[PDB]
Design a protein around this nucleic acid. Structure first.
Ligand SMILES: [Mg+2]
Ligand SMILES: [Mg+2]
Ligand SMILES: [Mg+2]
Ligand SMILES: [Mg+2]
Lengths: 57, 102, 118, 67, 233
RNA sequence: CGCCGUUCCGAAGGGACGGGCGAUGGCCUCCGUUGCCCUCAGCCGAUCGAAAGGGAGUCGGGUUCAGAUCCCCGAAUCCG
RNA sequence: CCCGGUGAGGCGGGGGGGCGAGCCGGGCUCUCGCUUCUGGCGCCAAGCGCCCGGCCGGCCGGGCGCGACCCGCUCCGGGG
């Protein structure tokens, strides 16, 4: 609908029942959860080696 | 005699640049603490055609180091850069295509 | 104490309300658009009669400056009737014509006799 | 009788003292607008012998004109 | 007992990482034009060469001498408007049924007194602007042998005379009980100002580079000195 | 007389959820309003510029000598 | 005096800490200031130390400091 017609629509008609629903596609929302999780894990992996390497150092 | 065409170009008028559909001025980042000492990361969002310019323009996005904001920069697109690529600007950026170094 | 912003801005300073020693105008100006000013005279043409009889509508010539709310309130006070709505146009000769429709509990044909139109 | 000393002092415009004052004042005057309300006469003795009186209603304005 | 939920959540403020804290930017503020002007004028007076006639006013009394000088002067303040009315009315009743010593204020009144040798001590504010109003007074007092001193604040001399500001004041007479105090002040003031006048009038001021420049020169030499020191080891 | 200039040499914000002090009120119970203070605040350009650009929401039937998506009848809708 | 940039956001000097070098565990030569895999996220403080208030040691509510080094005279550079 036209942008000013969204004012008189209820919320349910303007979004989806999901994180980012109505603003981000499901396909790319699945990808950010994996990316956010997978990248956060690599930090721990890198951090552990840093401390473990420093531990020996 | 009368004023010649070359003279008339400097008065503006019908001789000004056609800037209606241009995307903005293509510039590097404004040098700040991050680029003076280290580097800052940025992601290439889009590569766009600029009317009146042969070269494409890259739309790089950085994090504001002092505020919760995204900064959109309009760079000259070095050949070989792509969207989604990370570019780094600063004194300690690595010598890669698209990076900005002193 | 400290400045967390590199910008300097004009600080807000007290702004007092006016307290005149005298009023510039000795008295308020009288209202020149009272009810008797708004309604000039009723229109009695053939089409005005049709409005009264068929559409329960009175037709008045009114001050060009008056608005619908003013016309409605003037009509009610002058003739002690109720008004449903008001339609207005400005005539080609500059006068403003008001098509005043009365509430269903009022008979424009009767009201016109009170006013003297019919 | 200080107005006598100041008058004589402002006649030695090429002396080290007055050269320093004229130079920094010209610099300061150059950072302001071409028309500027001055809080008081920069030259109280010169102003008064031109009619100025130090009373309410007299005002001073500094005007910058291109040479 | 400590709640196991509570924990540290430190912020890393390295380039990148977390947004920087709201630190004090006082040094990097873009100040109004009028603030920039008066600060850049204070830097020029340090940077340039200030002639001794203008620079003599940077030498002033210490707080302890100024406090004594100001407490003695406090005993000779001119009568206020309100208390002069009382003095006049008291004379009216006196009629129906001498001039005490008092401070002399104003560069014009003090100048005439100094020329006449009727002043015993002259106090000159250090921040008179235009300086031309008093730039000659130290030399004039010295010629006539009238001891003079320079005090911090034309506003302090202003409060003496119950006015916003005063360029200079002068002692002409003191009470017998206060003659000793003036003699003590005059002696200290005379040595610092009237006796050193020969060196005061040759002592230029200013001509000091900024901190960054000085450090830059100091570093450049220290390389030579260390290189010179390493020359022989 | 004025002109250039439109963010460029400018202390360019008269605003806000919240909190604190009072002054008042009313369905005086407790809630409003107001003044000050605290706190927070990019938009960075007054204003003008289109009856073909952007721009919520009205359709059917009847009616006049001349007006109607405007009047009347019927059925709706947007905005506040 | 001029030019460029910036919402004039970390400049100069010293302090403090890490990696190497080296003279006989300490001083220095002297460097670094925590972000490079991925088309995520990232503000409006955690924690600690010290004070104060309200109610009956326990509940409720605040202030300051460190965290976020110290001092300075030109915002930072380029000319001159
Ligand atoms: Mg408009
Ligand atoms: Mg239009
Ligand atoms: Mg249109
Ligand atoms: Mg309708």
């Amino acid at each position: 609908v036209r942008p000013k017609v969204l004012m008189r629509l209820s919320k349910t008609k303007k979004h989806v029942s999901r994180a980012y629903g109505g603003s981000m596609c499901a396909k790319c929302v699945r990808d950010r959860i994996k990316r956010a999780f997978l990248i956060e894990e690599q930090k721990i992996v890198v951090k552990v080696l840093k401390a473990q390497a420093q531990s020996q150092k | 005699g009368r004023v010649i065409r070359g003279q008339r170009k400097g008065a503006g008028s019908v001789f000004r640049a056609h800037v209606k559909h241009r995307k903005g001025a293509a510039r590097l980042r404004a040098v700040d603490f991050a680029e003076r000492h280290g580097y800052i990361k940025g992601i290439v969002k889009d590569i766009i055609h600029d009317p009146g310019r042969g070269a494409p323009l890259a739309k790089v996005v950085f994090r504001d180091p002092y505020r919760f904001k995204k900064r959109t920069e309009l760079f000259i697109a070095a050949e070989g850069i792509h969207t989604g690529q990370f570019v780094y600007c600063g004194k300690k950026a690595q010598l890669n295509i698209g990076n900005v170094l002193p | 104490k400290i400045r967390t912003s590199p910008t300097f801005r004009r600080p807000k300073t007290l702004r007092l309300r006016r307290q005149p020693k005298y009023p510039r105008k000795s008295a308020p100006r009288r209202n020149k658009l009272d009810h008797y000013a708004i309604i000039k005279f009723p229109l009695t043409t053939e089409s005005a009669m049709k409005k009264i009889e068929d559409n329960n509508t009175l037709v008045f010539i009114v001050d060009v400056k008056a608005n619908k709310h003013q016309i409605k309130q003037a009509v009610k006070k002058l003739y002690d009737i109720d008004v449903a709505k008001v339609n207005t146009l400005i005539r080609p000769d500059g006068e403003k014509k008001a098509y005043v429709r009365l509430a269903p509990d009022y008979d424009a044909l009767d009201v016109a006799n009170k006013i003297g139109i019919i | 009788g200080a107005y006598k000393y100041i008058q004589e002092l402002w006649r030695k415009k090429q002396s080290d003292v007055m050269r320093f004052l004229l130079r920094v004042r010209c610099w300061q005057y150059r950072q302001l607008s071409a028309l500027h309300r001055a809080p008081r006469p920069t030259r109280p003795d010169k102003a008064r012998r031109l009619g100025y009186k130090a009373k309410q209603g007299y005002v001073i304005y500094r005007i910058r004109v291109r040479r | 007992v400590v709640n196991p939920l509570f924990e540290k959540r430190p912020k890393n403020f390295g380039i990148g990482q977390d947004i920087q804290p709201k630190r004090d930017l006082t040094r990097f503020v873009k100040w109004p034009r009028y603030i920039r002007l008066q600060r850049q004028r204070a830097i020029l007076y340090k940077r340039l060469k200030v002639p001794p006639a203008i620079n003599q006013f940077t030498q002033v009394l210490d707080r302890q001498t100024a406090t004594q000088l100001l407490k003695l002067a406090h005993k000779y303040r001119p009568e206020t408007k309100q208390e002069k009315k009382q003095r006049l009315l008291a004379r009216a009743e006196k009629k129906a049924a001498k001039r005490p010593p008092v401070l002399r204020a104003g560069v014009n009144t003090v100048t005439t007194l100094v020329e006449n040798k009727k002043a015993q001590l002259v106090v000159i504010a250090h921040d008179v602007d235009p300086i031309e109003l008093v730039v000659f007074l130290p030399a004039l007092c010295r010629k006539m042998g009238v001891p003079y001193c320079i005090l911090k604040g034309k506003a302090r001399l202003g409060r003496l005379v119950h006015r916003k500001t005063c360029t200079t004041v002068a002692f002409t007479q003191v009470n017998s009980e206060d003659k000793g105090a003036l003699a003590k002040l005059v002696e200290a003031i005379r040595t610092n100002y009237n006796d050193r006048y020969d060196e005061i009038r040759r002592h230029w001021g200013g001509n000091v580079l900024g901190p960054k420049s000085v450090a830059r020169i100091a570093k450049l030499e220290k390389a030579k000195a260390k290189e010179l020191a390493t020359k022989l080891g």
